[model samples]
Target: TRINLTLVSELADQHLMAEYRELPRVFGAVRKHVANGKRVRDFKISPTFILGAGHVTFFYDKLEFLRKRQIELIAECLKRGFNIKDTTVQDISDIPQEFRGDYIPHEASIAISQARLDEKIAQRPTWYKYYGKAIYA
Candidate 1:
């Protein structure tokens, strides 16, 4: 059997892990959002259908590639003048409430969430399938 869930977590400088501060390169790019108006470099990783609604099945992808692609889209979204009113900051769900899975301490898993959310559609999930599980059993 196959099942998936997507959860949304907003990020700013404060919420990021301690290790991200010492990244080999500068952390994810900073964009000026017209909304979420605290004037901070922040982000929220969006999820995929394969991870939730629709889906994709493939071998693992290159993280660097995914990271690079995410930046490109973020830059493009800014270039195109995306705004909260026009689907810039958004979520995906049908049910009344959403479930954010427990905090994942694995360094790389957070990395996957970071990369995937960047390019995924801005919607979240009905409820997350936490299972208190790590990547896969």
Candidate 2:
């Protein structure tokens, strides 16, 4: 469970600075805080609902699940005295052209690869799906 302290701080800084506003990006911040025992909020529920006490249901939407949660988590970090800076400013030039856009290059690449895998899985035959136990026979 070794953590990259500098990298975690860098990601948190990016998150707080609004450079990483996407759910995946901010989720990294949440993970860092939880790992370091800095995050006191329960993340298993919708972040918006986590601050309050009540029954909550989990649902996924790109905007609500990721974007809103990222914002909430970053705010929590700030309240906890999380200090981070734009550590990636100097490394922007290193990001490949195809991966350059809203997301950190590495995160973008991971999403792209995951999408590709999902597409491949979708193209598999039902027999193969059953063999893989992805669906009931």
Candidate 3:
């Protein structure tokens, strides 16, 4: 997001401009050939993931649970040699109620989210905290 100006001073001593001047004659022709041959098969940063906001404790925890549990479930299936490819939802019945889809009240979800964050902050006092910021006072 921001450039480090101090790095430029250290880099100044590197004296790459002289090498760079020679580089064009040494490899410019080959690099141009590759670029022309490859024709710039281009890509960009990820577009598949969309952002979501959860200012309330409940909403934040809900997202955390969903994300972490999905990862855990996927890992369990892979580690235990459970059926994974082309699987049915019924096949995933092994997932516990803690992780399974179920409706929870907004207030209760928020309660737990902040509660967990509070407990973690107690344990990891020096840690960089998050999720609690979503809970305003």
Candidate 4:
């Protein structure tokens, strides 16, 4: 069986930069790290809990704001000292169930993995159509 995983990065341009300044302080920390020449690749800022780890919930307001903020932060970095023409501030997730284990805990990994794969295909662009018809059910 062959699995094709798609990983896309959001393009961070000038317009995106202006929109990121409206996010929370935690996001600001993320922005600072990205601005200071830090590698933003797979930079997961998931919320943790004492009950366990990687137990995150989709907070609508937070996600909505963060998505826009990241784009702006990427743009700001380009304006500063980086040669960032392909900056992506978009939210990223793995396409294959097997690959999503890193972000989710081992116990609930399989369920979360399947759910993510399903969500990614259902909501993502048609460019990702190939995956759903291929390896995934």
- Per-candidate TM-scores read 0.21, 0.22, 0.22, 0.23
Question: What tens digits encode model 3's per-residue C-alpha lDDT throughout 110-135?
Answer: 45444544454456454431222222
Task: Return the TM-score for candidate 1, rounded to 2 decimals.
Answer: 0.21
lDDT of each: 0.27, 0.33, 0.29, 0.36
Each model's backbone clash number? 7, 0, 2, 4
Better candidate by lDDT, 1 or 3: 3
Q: Candidate 3, overall lDDT? A: 0.29
Q: Candidate order by lDDT, highest to lowest?
A: 4, 2, 3, 1
The candidate that wins on TM-score is 4
Candidate 1 wrong stretches, greater than 4 Å: 1-55, 84-137
Candidate 2 segments whose C-alpha is farther than 4 A from its true place = 1-23, 26-61, 86-137
lDDT of 1 by residue, 1-137 (tens): 11111221233212122112222121111111222332222333333323433221210112233233334434433443433123222221211121212222255545655655444322333222122222221
**Whose lDDT is higher: candidate 1's or candidate 4's?**
4
Candidate 2 residues 75-126, lDDT tens each? 5445546564422222222222322223222554345434543453456434
Model 3 TM-score is: 0.22
